[PDB]
Amino acid sequence: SQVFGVARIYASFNDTFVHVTDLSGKETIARVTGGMKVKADRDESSPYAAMLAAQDVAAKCKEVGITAVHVKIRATGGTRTKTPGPGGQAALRALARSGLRIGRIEDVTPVPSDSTRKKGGRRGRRL
Amino acid sequence: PKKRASNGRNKKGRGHVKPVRCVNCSKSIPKDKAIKRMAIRNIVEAAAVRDLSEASVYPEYALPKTYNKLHYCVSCAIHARIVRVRSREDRKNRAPP
Amino acid sequence: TPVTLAKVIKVLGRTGSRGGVTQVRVEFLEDTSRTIVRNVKGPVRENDILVLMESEREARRLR
Amino acid sequence: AKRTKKVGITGKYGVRYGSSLRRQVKKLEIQQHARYDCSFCGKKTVKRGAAGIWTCSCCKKTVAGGAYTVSTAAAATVRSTIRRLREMVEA
Amino acid sequence: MRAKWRKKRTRRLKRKRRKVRARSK
Amino acid sequence: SGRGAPLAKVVFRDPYKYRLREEIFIANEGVHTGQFIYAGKKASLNVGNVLPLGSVPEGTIVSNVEEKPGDRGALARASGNYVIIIGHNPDENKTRVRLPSGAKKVISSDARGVIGVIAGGGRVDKPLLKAGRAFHKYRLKRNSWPKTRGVAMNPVDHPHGGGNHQHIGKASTISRGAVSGQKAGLIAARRTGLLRG
Amino acid sequence: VVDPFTRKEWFDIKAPSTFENRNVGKTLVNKSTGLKSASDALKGRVVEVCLADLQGSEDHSFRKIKLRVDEVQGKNLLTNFHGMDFTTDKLRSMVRKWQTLIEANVTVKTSDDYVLRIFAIAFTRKQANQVKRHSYAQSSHIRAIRKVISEILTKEVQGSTLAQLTSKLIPEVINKEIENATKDIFPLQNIHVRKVKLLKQPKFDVGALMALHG
RNA sequence: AAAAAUGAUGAA
RNA sequence: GGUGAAAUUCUUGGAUUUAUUGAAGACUAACUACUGCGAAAGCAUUUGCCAAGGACGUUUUCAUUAAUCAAGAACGAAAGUUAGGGGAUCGAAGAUGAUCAGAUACCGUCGUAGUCUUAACCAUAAACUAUGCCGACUAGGGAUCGGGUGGUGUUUUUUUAAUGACCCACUCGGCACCUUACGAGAAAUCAAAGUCUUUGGGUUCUGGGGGGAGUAUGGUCGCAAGGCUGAAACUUAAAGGAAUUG
């Protein structure tokens, strides 16, 4: 009784992608990032930016016909942090509170079973 | 002088282990020495739990968790307050709390 | 209408480097079951009513 | 008695062409003039006629091989790979 | 100065000494 | 003479007339005198056998490969060279292979090749050490040795000739569209200098 | 300049008969144009579905399913089995410390020419009344368990059609029989197939697809 | 995880 | 994208992001431990082949065949060297954007050699337990790995009736750990670093205040880088260890 999409939230540091697609995933509806909700260049990964992006994405999911959405949360992954950025939870909650129905949340961060050498050098990034 | 009977690590019997990389700075640290934490968290924050349970299409959803094993070097663990410098006798305690 | 009335049901503590901001928990007046945590500038009591220009941002910088 | 300390067979070249080139040539000429085991008759009688041609002094069998060795590592690897592919095709 | 840098700069100096003495010889 | 790779004399029976037919194969390494060679669509996958590209599996090492079926061998003929089979396209009746230069090629699966690698490999690893051996090498091939540098000539003789010092004097990279008499140096070079620094 | 969603049809997606309720969801492509038709852009699509939704039960909350569109007829996309996998939360919740992790892996082809890779996962179990801290296995038990798991998996596949494999994956009979076969070697906790991937496909043979959709 | 260099000689 | 903040870069020729494929090289996460194996360096995907090894069991066999070792020999992280293959990633050098008084530093973006492999070299590390090896004895305790013994112990298809896992009690061997030091030590600490002025179980190697200096020179090994061996003149009253208070 509801039409489902897939939200495909990518919550890194430095940015947050909110990207709804069909079930197949190859048709995209309302990909909005925090970097085009804020103009600060450092607040691009903020929860406020993520919430504004998710509100826009829900607005465009409506009047296109998406009523419910499955959720694929993701971090940068690979050899990088694979900890979700600040904006993932704010985008999730904005999607849930902006009229969209929700189902089947899952974490799809790319995790290596083993990997190329990580960036930074042997002694790491020295601050 | 020698600060620690187990110099800074857990390696008695082998000699070489393998490096891991620090999650914060990517410093190479032997696995036996690295400070290791298991981050098991609900995939949805506690303040958003009610909102997502009300917005769910499933009457009885399970609210999955995320599992992530973090490896810290000594400097990053101390800077991030994961471990703290301890008094001379308190250093000998190995219990987690 | 972008004006939200929320009532302070609990004062959490002081925040800010200089201690000028206060963590509070407020419940909405339109519905008395939706509580949020906000950062407040001046002196606050329990049962004080705040005016929320926006009403979705959770308060950061906790203690 | 030991007549040369290191030049070996390249002592025919005297002092010319450079010691590195003489060392490379020494390695490959020792390989090229060695006697090799015959895979057919089991004797140590296989010598090079010309590059790639290896003939056993007895049983007179000739096998195509490497320029300076009877078998190259590539040819052995190819033989093993072809055997494996043959085995899966036949089974 | 750090010991490994004493060693490194001394090694460079020994290279220069060998070079000038080979020049003489 | 003039060839690094040894040759195998392989004699077959004539299917249609009572007589023998001698063929001149490029010997693959490990092939011996007195060995039975099988050629055809139903030949077994053994070193020295001649098979169509379609009938052999992925990763097969072949040599003397036909670009077109029936041209009797065009690819991977020099000593130590081979072709790697890297895939099939049964609907198109094509086989994808890797050539010795690294190029990827698509050939009809009816083209034949010899299982194995051309014999005589490792030949260019040994230095010639002296002009006399290069002389004997090229007197069995053709008159392309020795080579006089263009900058050692006069302007009448070569584009690089002349000058009060030996020097090219203009870029030695020459366009593909240049005419005969101009194409000396590096023709249509996409890049110059030492590869990967 | 132009709204791109005025040229969409919202094709419906149908699951094979080897599942509970057939209606999976919805998808959209484009208006069929004389240059490019919707069918080509709509075939080959992989739709990711939770087996809980395919079966109408929450005990299949993990172990998601991939459905591959094989052809379009009318406004219905008839899918077929394309893969199975566990959810990340399930895998990470099962992989805990102080127990041995046993993984097995086979590649086998069904009765029809569906060559596919089957995985399998199991963990060592503490006995009731066990006082020892960890319950690790002795690396010969692991090899014996892996051998018997491989034979069981190779035996249930290549003796079945892809449909029969799916219809025996849903009730989880392979992991129960793995437990029965391994119970004399070492006790185990979480025996699962965890993943099925398909490597090569046979000819289209649309008759079998229509046998699964009817 | 912004920046922060230096401090003449002897002197119960 | 990236950062503390940026910029260098990419981007309506569609970047980033989504999907379906493919190729390549490298790695072997989670499980993973005060756990295992190896002479050390080291060694973590599956399966097959090849030889090897410790411990245990042994009313098997030989009978001193042993311990430590100048000379001598094999192996020996990383980097580095020669030549071929490979060359995804990261990344000395280099190039660039920042920061800065400067900043060819830290931070950012690239990027050569290198990183991987085959065949040869090199022979060095805080190559560390900064504790040579062999042997004997001296204190309480609980775990753990491998082997063995016992229990009329539990548990699994049939509920002692076709045999693993677990439990209990011992034992040999091992990685260790906790408490305490009767003892030792300058102390830190140590179960050996004890059995040392009540000084002797056997044996090898090394040191003799700090610098000059692991330098010069000679020899020798190495393709080289360099390794090994290795002074003197001269100079100087401390340098150094472990703790205490600030």
Curated annotation (Swiss-Prot), chain A:
Residue span of region Disordered: 107-127
Keyword Acetylation: yes
UniProt keyword Nucleus, yes or no: yes
GO annotation (BP), single: translation
InterPro entries: Ribosomal_uS11, Ribosomal_uS11_CS, Ribosomal_uS11_sf
Signal peptide: none
Post-translational modification: N-terminally acetylated by acetyltransferase NatA.
Primary subcellular site in the record, as a coarse category: cytoplasm
Residue spans of biased composition, Basic residues class: 118-127
Compartments where found: Cytoplasm; Nucleus, Nucleolus
Disulfide bonds: none
GO CC field: 90S preribosome; cytosol; cytosolic small ribosomal subunit; nucleolus; nucleoplasm; small-subunit processome
Subunit structure: Component of the small ribosomal subunit (SSU). Mature yeast ribosomes consist of a small (40S) and a large (60S) subunit. The 40S small subunit contains 1 molecule of ribosomal RNA (18S rRNA) and 33 different proteins (encoded by 57 genes). The large 60S subunit contains 3 rRNA molecules (25S, 5.8S and 5S rRNA) and 46 different proteins (encoded by 81 genes). uS11 interacts with eS1 forming part of the mRNA exit tunnel. uS11 interacts with snoRNA U3. uS11 interacts with MPP10. Component of the ribosomal small subunit (SSU) processome composed of at least 40 protein subunits and snoRNA U3.
UniProt-listed HAMAP family: Ribosomal_uS11
The protein, known as: Small ribosomal subunit protein uS11A
Lineage summary: Eukaryota, Fungi, Dikarya, Ascomycota, Saccharomycotina
Designated gene of the protein: RPS14A
Swiss-Prot record, chain D:
InterPro entries associated with the record: Ribosomal_eL37/eL43, Ribosomal_eL43, Ribosomal_protein_eL43, Ribosomal_zn-bd
Gene: RPL43A
Record's keyword annotation contains Ribonucleoprotein: yes
GO CC entries: cytosol; cytosolic large ribosomal subunit
Keywords: Cytoplasm, Metal-binding, Phosphoprotein, Ribonucleoprotein, Ribosomal protein, Zinc, Zinc-finger
Record-given protein name: Large ribosomal subunit protein eL43A
Localization terms from the record: Cytoplasm
Miscellaneous comment as given in the Swiss-Prot or TrEMBL entry: Present with 44600 molecules/cell in log phase SD medium.
Family, per entry: Belongs to the eukaryotic ribosomal protein eL43 family.
Known role: Component of the ribosome, a large ribonucleoprotein complex responsible for the synthesis of proteins in the cell. The small ribosomal subunit (SSU) binds messenger RNAs (mRNAs) and translates the encoded message by selecting cognate aminoacyl-transfer RNA (tRNA) molecules. The large subunit (LSU) contains the ribosomal catalytic site termed the peptidyl transferase center (PTC), which catalyzes the formation of peptide bonds, thereby polymerizing the amino acids delivered by tRNAs into a polypeptide chain.
Organism, as annotated: Saccharomyces cerevisiae (strain ATCC 204508 / S288c) (Baker's yeast)
Major location category of this protein: cytoplasm
Any one of the GO BP annotations: cytoplasmic translation
Start-end of C4-type zinc fingers: 38-59
Residues where Phosphoserine is found: S39
Domain of life: Eukaryota
GO molecular function: structural constituent of ribosome; zinc ion binding
From Swiss-Prot, chain E:
Region annotation (Disordered) ranges: 1-25
Primary subcellular site in the record, as a coarse category: cytoplasm
Pfam (any one): Ribosomal_L41
Molecular functions (GO terms): structural constituent of ribosome
The keyword Oxidoreductase is annotated on this UniProt entry: no
Record field: transmembrane: none
Any single biological process term in GO: cytoplasmic translation
InterPro entries named among the record's database cross-references: Ribosomal_eS32
Keywords in alphabetical order: Cytoplasm, Ribonucleoprotein, Ribosomal protein
Domain of life, per lineage: Eukaryota
One cellular-component annotation, GO: cytosol
Cellular compartment(s): Cytoplasm
Note: Present with 11900 molecules/cell in log phase SD medium. There are 2 genes for this protein in yeast.
Subunit field text: Component of the small ribosomal subunit (SSU). Mature yeast ribosomes consist of a small (40S) and a large (60S) subunit. The 40S small subunit contains 1 molecule of ribosomal RNA (18S rRNA) and 33 different proteins (encoded by 57 genes). The large 60S subunit contains 3 rRNA molecules (25S, 5.8S and 5S rRNA) and 46 different proteins (encoded by 81 genes).
Function: Component of the ribosome, a large ribonucleoprotein complex responsible for the synthesis of proteins in the cell. The small ribosomal subunit (SSU) binds messenger RNAs (mRNAs) and translates the encoded message by selecting cognate aminoacyl-transfer RNA (tRNA) molecules. The large subunit (LSU) contains the ribosomal catalytic site termed the peptidyl transferase center (PTC), which catalyzes the formation of peptide bonds, thereby polymerizing the amino acids delivered by tRNAs into a polypeptide chain.
Family listed: Belongs to the eukaryotic ribosomal protein eS32 family.
Protein name: Small ribosomal subunit protein eS32A
Curated annotation (Swiss-Prot), chain F:
Record carries keyword Cytoplasm: yes
Per UniProt, location of the Glycyl lysine isopeptide (Lys-Gly) (interchain with G-Cter in ubiquitin) cross-link in this chain: K42, K68, K94
GO biological process annotation, one example: maintenance of translational fidelity
Alphabetic keyword roster: Cytoplasm, Isopeptide bond, Phosphoprotein, Ribonucleoprotein, Ribosomal protein, RNA-binding, rRNA-binding, Ubl conjugation
Modified residues (Phosphoserine): S1, S44, S108, S109
GO MF, any single term: RNA binding
GO cellular component: cytosol; cytosolic large ribosomal subunit
Location(s) in or outside the cell: Cytoplasm
Family under the similarity heading: Belongs to the universal ribosomal protein uL2 family.
Subunit architecture: Component of the large ribosomal subunit (LSU). Mature yeast ribosomes consist of a small (40S) and a large (60S) subunit. The 40S small subunit contains 1 molecule of ribosomal RNA (18S rRNA) and 33 different proteins (encoded by 57 genes). The large 60S subunit contains 3 rRNA molecules (25S, 5.8S and 5S rRNA) and 46 different proteins (encoded by 81 genes).
Note: There are 2 genes for uL2 in yeast.
Role of this protein: Component of the ribosome, a large ribonucleoprotein complex responsible for the synthesis of proteins in the cell. The small ribosomal subunit (SSU) binds messenger RNAs (mRNAs) and translates the encoded message by selecting cognate aminoacyl-transfer RNA (tRNA) molecules. The large subunit (LSU) contains the ribosomal catalytic site termed the peptidyl transferase center (PTC), which catalyzes the formation of peptide bonds, thereby polymerizing the amino acids delivered by tRNAs into a polypeptide chain.
Gene name of this polypeptide: RPL2A
